[model samples]
Target: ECISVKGRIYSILKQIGSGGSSKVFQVLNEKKQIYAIKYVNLEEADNQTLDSYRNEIAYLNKLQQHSDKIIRLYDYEITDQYIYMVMECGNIDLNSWLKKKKSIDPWERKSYWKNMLEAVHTIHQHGIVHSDLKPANFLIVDGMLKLIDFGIANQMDSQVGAVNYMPPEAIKDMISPKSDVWSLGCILYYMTYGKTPFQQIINQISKLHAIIDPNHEIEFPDIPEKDLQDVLKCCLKRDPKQRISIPELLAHPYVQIQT
Candidate 1:
């Protein structure tokens, strides 16, 4: 089936992606611009949860005109069947890109991290938290980075999720702008090492099902540069209060490399 809103016609194309509670499709607008349309099925969601999803849409729509870092929200419409959201389209995400590259240069890695940090900072400044910050959620197009998939993102003051790249305070649900900074650190580590810090320890074990094997300890290879090692260490601080902030990260010499 198809629908029209505000003079624009949206034809449902093939379903491109899906998550725990939503489905995404490739769509085109009247102007022939291709976009990804997200459909949220609200029939199974409670009123409060549905309202939160709407708030996420409203937040992205409001920031649509910002910059290339954030995805553009063109339009949205809710019906008894589905809640549709029209958004910009981009190429493969960082995870897939990294897999294709096999390994990335230090300078290229720094450049990507810089862009990701800027995007997170922009959203944080507006009181929003991209609670789920990972390689799979960041898109790369024409060598530039774009943040996408804000389904679980919100403008709340509290935070949730694991302590992978987040500060200890964040683990306790005391989320703040620095929370993204911590997650960014983890992403950088993953990109450089080709695996998460604790992957070896949790090998073959699902993140949720992996019991903390006390015998295992996280390890890092012998990184050549002292400055780079120092920066990663600072970002991975177990104490959320001690984690580096966006401003601090931006000023770090390690992240100032040429692309």
Candidate 2:
């Protein structure tokens, strides 16, 4: 798929990725730096969907020059029927990288977790909650972690996260900064246990039954460190008020533990 941008040609190298409604491609610009371009087919677009795309761009513009902890949005072009976004290329997403890492030393793992937490905290500081927090949205750029994928991010509230990572309030179509803390809890559990919280549950409906059931306990791996356990407990609290805030989470003994 060859595309034209400002009289120059960006040769579409290949289909690098596919999302719910858009396609991501690897391309080489005239400058030859590898860039990932997301192409959205906006045929018969509803205002709501269009607004989400617009909202993402707005957030990206605000953050593009603000932080190195996020993937840089280089440029964007829109036409009557499509939206194209040019983003800096990263080595890989954490979802894949985390899986390949069958084992990671606690100290090293802490560094990664800490960096991502800082990135998310930065977003929140700007009043933007990365409502959808998942490993796939974290990019590894030159050995550093950078957050990506703000398409569904904004001030709105509602079923805004992936099935497995969503918190109770998000299920009710509400999102607070605390909601992301819950998601961070899920990732912590995932990285430790090699599985997500309530992985045995079949669907969102059943998962909700489990999450809401006071008797259903959140599971952990063989990790028995008390400081780490405390972090997990605070993160997975069913009540957002009872849950640990991001600032508090950063101050956690587990997060700040010395090797």
Candidate 3:
């Protein structure tokens, strides 16, 4: 179902993956520069939908200007049939990497988490919220985390869908910088337990109802460091108001911030 653009003559390496709206291809451009080309079908979209598509590109373009956390947008081309976005090719995403490694070592996990925090903090500073923050959306490159797939990411104050990583308040559209905090917490939980905290909670009841459960506490195994546990607990706070901010999280002992 996926086809390569002909004129480019970029040697098609492989098909990376396909999402609900687009397909990604690993290719070598004319200059032999490797890139990931994301193709989106624009012909089937209307004006408002087209604007959203353009907005995603605009957001990535803006983000590329600020942080190295994102996959840099190299170039873009649009035809009557589709939109092709070329980006610096990065390696497998966190989910796939984790699968290969079976489980991450403690220090390695910390390094990955720190990288994610730094990237997300940078994005938040730009007044943008990556509504979809998950292992699948982060790539490992040069031993650093490169955030990818900003399709659901939007400028703040926009209503978006319910993502598993987001907090309860975010589901109600009360999103803020703290939304990322909640997401990070959920991600951390997944890292620790190899599963989401409330997955079974939702399986027993509706997702909406599970979000409101006061007893939705995250389970943690015994860790040697109390500070680490404390940091995770604070991040998983049910109330958005009670959640720790990015700066506060940066200050936590669990995070090793480089100068």
Candidate 4:
């Protein structure tokens, strides 16, 4: 089927992604160019939810202007019932990319890691904290990883991101750029081990406690890469102050190694 916005019609190829109260579709223009369109329903959304959507568009427009690692927004259409955001299309999210690969080469892994860190560092340098830093938010576009989903993101540089990736301080409602570092740590753990650091605990409370408790350290499976292990430790430090900053992580010998 086709969807019309601003007097232009686009062919809806398929639904590519969905979250909360929004749905994303892969769309094609008359010139056969591909794009991703995200639409949020306004009627049933609360004021807070509406504000997030507004912020997402506002921030994306401002940030993507200078950053290629950030998703590019082409146009948007807002009406009484919906807000449609047209953006650069991505082949797959990091989550799906990771799921498909059981093992990746060392150089490839480092490239992805560097791209992820650079994206976060870029946002941090601009004085914004993504708050939500997860594999799903990093889309693989044309072999490069780009950041997306700024719905809960805030400048102060912000959330309570996904529970699995959230840091201890975030659970207590204290958030900052360091919180993003913690989430990045969790993402690294997932990429390295094929599971999140807290994957074993099924109960939400237990999981929460496991994350926040200082004594409950994250378990690391035996991996040969010692430098990578150290990097993860720095990122996952329970104390925000102790966690490695994005610039520091970027400078780390682990990420610095290029073949």
Model 4 misplaced stretches (Cα beyond 4 Å):
19-21, 153-162, 172-174
lDDT of 3 by residue, 14-93 (tens): 88867546778898876777888887776667777777777777878888877787778887887767888777888788
Q: How far is candidate 4 from the true structure (C-alpha RMSD, Å)?
A: 4.0
- lDDT, candidate 1, 153-196, per-residue tens: 33222253333543445334424676676677778778767876
Better of 1 and 2 by lDDT: 2
Candidate 4 per-residue lDDT, tens place, 83-119, comes to 8888899999988788898876766777788888887
**lDDT tens readout by residue for model 2, 186-224:** 887777667788877877789987876768878755565
* Candidate 4 lDDT trough over 10 residues, lowest sum: 153-162
Q: Which window of ten consecutive residues has the lowest lDDT sum in model 3?
A: 153-162
**Model 2: how far residue 98 lies from native, Å:** 3.1
Candidate 4 yields a Cα-based lDDT of 0.81
Q: In candidate 3, list every pair of residues with a backbone clash.
A: none
Looking at model 1, report the run of 10 residues with the lowest lDDT sum: 205-214
Residue 240 in candidate 4, Cα distance off native in Å: 1.0
Q: TM per model?
A: 0.79, 0.86, 0.84, 0.88
Q: By descending TM-score, how would the candidates be arranged?
A: 4, 2, 3, 1
Question: What pairs collide in candidate 4?
Answer: none
lDDT of each: 0.68, 0.78, 0.73, 0.81
Better of 1 and 3 by lDDT: 3
Show where candidate 2 strays beyond 4 Å.
19-21, 151-162, 171-174, 221-225
Ranking of predictions according to lDDT: 4, 2, 3, 1
